[PDB]
Every structure is written in C-alpha cells, then in structure tokens.
Design a protein around this ligand. Structure first.
Ligand SMILES: Cn1ccnc1Sc1cc(C(=O)Nc2nccs2)c(N)cc1F
Ligand SMILES: OC[C@H]1O[C@H](O)[C@H](O)[C@@H](O)[C@@H]1O
Ligand code: NA
Length: 448
C-alpha cells in the first residue's frame, strides 16, 4: 500500500474529469472570440478547410508529412466515388530526420526535405512531372488561407531556428526552388488532425472530428462560421484546429499537475508549453513512468533502492516500453526483459510494481484525454438540434492505436461524459496522406 499510495496520486474522479471538461469548453470558447483569441491557451486556429464545397479535381497528388520523427513522402490517387471521392496511397517512402537538420536552421530543414522529395521522384521515375502537393504539417499554424499560414511555434521537440513566424508554405517553395530538380504546386497545407478527419469523412459523413494521440495530442472539429470570429463570414462551416495540447498553459490544470509533470515540463524543449499534451502524448508517457519509477527507488520501494545507469538517463524508458509492459501476459517475461535491457535485475514484485506504474500513467492519459474530447463533443452538441446526436471521430496515433487498453478506457470514459451522444470511433488508414490529398483535390479546383 505504500506503493499504491504513491500511484494513487494519478487517480482522477469523475468530478475532476467533468471539471477539466468544462474548463476545456471554456477555453475553446475563449480561443474563438476576437477579444480573447490572442491570450487564449487553446488557440482554436481556423484551418480554412470549409464545409464540403463540392467540386473535386481527380488525379494523382503528392502528399508530404512532417510532424513525426519520420518525414514521409507519398503519391496518392484521388478519383470519384459515389459517397464522394475515393483515395489511395500508391507509392510511399520514409526519410529519418537527421541531426544537423534539427539543430540547424529552418532553411536547412526544408533543404533536406527537398532532397527527400527529389530522391522519391528519382526512385519512382517521376521527377519529370508537376503535380498538386498536399502538405500535412503537424504543428500549430495560423492560416491566412488554405495554402498559407505561419508557424506559431514548434512542439514535440522540433527546434529549427528561423521557422517560427514565417509562411511555412513559403519555406517549402523557397527550398523547392533551390533545386530546379523538380517543381510541385503546393495547393493545401493541413494539420494531421484535419487530414485524419477528412479521410474518415468519406468513410462516414458523420465524422466531424479528427483526433491524434501519438507523439503529440490534439483535435480538430467542424465549427459554425458564425462562431469563427477570426474569419469574416457567418455562412457555412469551417474546421478548427484546437491545438488543445496547450490547454493548461495558463494554469487551467495547475491543481492536477504532479511532481513528475513539473519535472517533465522543466526538462522539455518547451518549458511551460503544451502542458495538457505532456500528460498524454507518447513523447512524454515513458518519461513520466521513468520519473515515477525513480521516486519509487528513492523511497526504497523498487529495485532495492538501487537505480541503474540507464534508468537515470532521460528518455531511457521509451513510451513503447510502457505499452509492452502492459501487454505482459502475467508471466512477467516481457517486463523482465525490458528492465533487464535497462541494466536491472528485478524481482517478481519489482515487475508487478513497474506494471502498476505504467497503468497509472497511461490510465490517467486516457481519462485526461477523454475529458478533452468530451468537451469538444458537448460544445458541438449545443449546435445540434436533435434528441440523440450521432457523431463520428477520426483517430490516429501510436498511443491510441497500439497501447493494449488505452483505447478501451478512453472510449468508456468519453461516453460517460457525453450524455445524449452516440459516438462512433474510426481509425484512419493513411489518414494524413489521403487527407492532405483529398483537400488538395478540392482546393485544386481553384488553383488549377
Ligand atoms: C468533415 N466534414 C463534414 C461536413 N463538411 C466537412 S469538411 C470537408 C472539407 C473538404 C475540403 O476539401 N474543404 C475545403 N475547403 C476549402 C478548401 S478545401 C472535403 N473534401 C470533405 C469534407 F468532409
Ligand atoms: O501530431 C499531433 C499534434 O502534436 C502537437 O500537439 C502539435 O502542436 C499539433 O499541431 C499536432 O496536431
Ligand atoms: Na466568422
């Protein structure tokens, strides 16, 4: 119980969740209003992706995806189905993100990107073509239009100087031209939430929400134009990028933050920012467990109070370890191997204890995240005149898709918080690639 008392600090009662939920809805409202959009922790960034303005140009598009620690480039074919347009990835390629490409400059960053876009073109005998380019850029961006927007700031660790504040599309072209080797036509730039939402739409027209729970955590949803005061017009609907990862950045979550959270935040590449996300995202989950394990050792409750060399090094406990630990069938073989690799020799009780630490940290991520989505869905519920609101949520991300029970816990908690709502969850198959392309196909009936 001494150990369970420490782990109990991660618990969240239903009331705590309803409180986080109400606060999220309140910050969402603040991010939308002209008078509070500037100081709002939840930016509610207009994406310019508007309510299905029929008219799609078919053909083959190129989709770029930057956000994860693995830059991807792919070709997707957009055609005309019954429901709407169909889409499919035909060719793809992944390029790891180099060191000097991160510490360097925004200039270099996109320089290397062009090198990858080219390589992809050569290796697929296609460098001799000019096609529409859909760019999935997973970061907070203030758009002026579907093909123009500036980077507010980096998240998830990226830190290329000379990026924040400039037209991201601009940087892309600026580098694509330092090549001549090829020429693309950037028709649209979207956030990964938006790409996932769009791709699921054609599968289920009721999907009006996109959510990511992977390295980072965020969501987007369809808003009524009259509520998007940062964009002239009251007619139609536009998708908004909440960037709820920064929820709590103005102290909204102060009463829930634990010592491990303050520690993770203080050593992060962005101290004081993305606090809500630091409670959920796979970029921080393993690190949280590591800190919890370290306190347990200093309390002399784990590993005989003797921490390994590796255990004391940041990022050693990878988020994938958390997921594997929770997949252990009960024979503790999985847990032992993982801890043995980190230079430890755990007992049966040490293993069970690491298991509990993981479940506490991941279970809190699931519930904390559920409050956010519940806030989004209930906010939308106010503008939905009907007994039972049926809505679909498009989801992607390693934490949500691969963690043994995150998904399950998350679903049950979200439903508990959304009375009068019938929520359907769908996972995207190449949500980003196909999403970016599908949006380029519509916006391309204006730029092409
Ligand atoms: C998600 N949802 C539901 C109703 N309307 C929407 S948004 C939506 C938007 C687009 C789309 O490409 N919109 C664009 N607006 C401006 C430029 S491209 C699409 N191709 C499909 C969609 F479903
Ligand atoms: O990749 C998921 C999310 O990660 C971070 O929170 C980014 O700021 C956000 O733009 C992105 O959608
Ligand atoms: Na408006």
């Amino acid at each position: 119980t001494l150990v369970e008392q420490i782990l109990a600090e991660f618990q969240l009662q239903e009331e705590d969740l309803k409180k986080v939920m109400r606060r999220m809805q309140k910050e969402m409202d603040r991010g939308l209003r002209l008078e509070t959009h500037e100081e709002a922790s939840v930016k509610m960034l207009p994406t310019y992706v508007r309510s299905t303005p029929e008219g799609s140009e078919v053909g083959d598009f190129l989709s770029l995806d930057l956000g994860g620690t693995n830059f991807r480039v792919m070709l997707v074919k957009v055609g005309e189905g019954e429901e709407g347009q169909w889409s499919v990835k035909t060719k793809h390629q992944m390029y790891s993100i180099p060191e000097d490409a991160m510490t360097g400059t925004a200039e270099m960053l996109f320089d290397y990107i062009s090198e990858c876009i080219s390589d992809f073109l050569d290796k697929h005998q296609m460098k001799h073509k000019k096609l529409p380019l859909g760019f999935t850029f997973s970061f907070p961006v203030r758009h002026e239009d579907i093909d123009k927007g500036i980077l507010l700031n980096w998240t998830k660790g990226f830190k290329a100087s000379g990026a924040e504040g400039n037209n991201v599309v601009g940087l892309l072209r600026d580098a694509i031209k330092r090549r001549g080797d090829f020429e693309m036509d950037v028709v649209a730039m979207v956030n990964d939430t938006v790409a996932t939402m769009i791709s699921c739409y054609y599968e289920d027209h009721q999907c009006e929400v996109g959510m990511i729970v992977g390295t980072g955590c965020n969501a987007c949803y369809m808003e009524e134009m009259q509520n998007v005061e940062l964009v002239e017009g009251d007619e139609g609907r536009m998708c908004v990028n909440t960037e709820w990862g920064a929820f709590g950045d103005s102290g909204e979550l102060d009463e829930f933050l634990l010592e491990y959270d303050r520690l993770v935040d203080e050593s992060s590449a962005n101290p004081g920012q993305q606090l809500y996300e630091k409670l959920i995202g796979g970029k921080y989950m393993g690190e949280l467990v590591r800190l919890v394990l370290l306190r347990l050792v200093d309390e002399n409750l784990l590993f005989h109070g003797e921490a390994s060399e590796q255990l004391r090094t940041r990022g050693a406990f990878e988020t994938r370890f958390v997921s594997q630990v929770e997949s252990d069938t009960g024979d503790r073989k999985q847990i032992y191997n993982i801890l043995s690799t980190l230079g430890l020799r755990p007992s049966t009780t040490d293993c069970d204890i690491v298991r509990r630490a993981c479940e506490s940290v991941s279970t809190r991520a699931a519930h904390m995240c559920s409050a956010g989505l519940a806030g989004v869905i209930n906010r939308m519920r106010e503008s939905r005149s009907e007994d039972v609101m049926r809505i679909t949520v498009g989801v992607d991300g390693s934490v949500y898709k691969l963690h043994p029970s995150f998904k399950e816990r998350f679903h049950a908690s979200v439903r508990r918080l959304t009375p009068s709502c019938e929520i359907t969850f769908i996972e995207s198959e190449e949500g980003s690639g196909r999403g970016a392309a599908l949006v380029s196909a519509v916006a391309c009936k204006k730029a092409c």
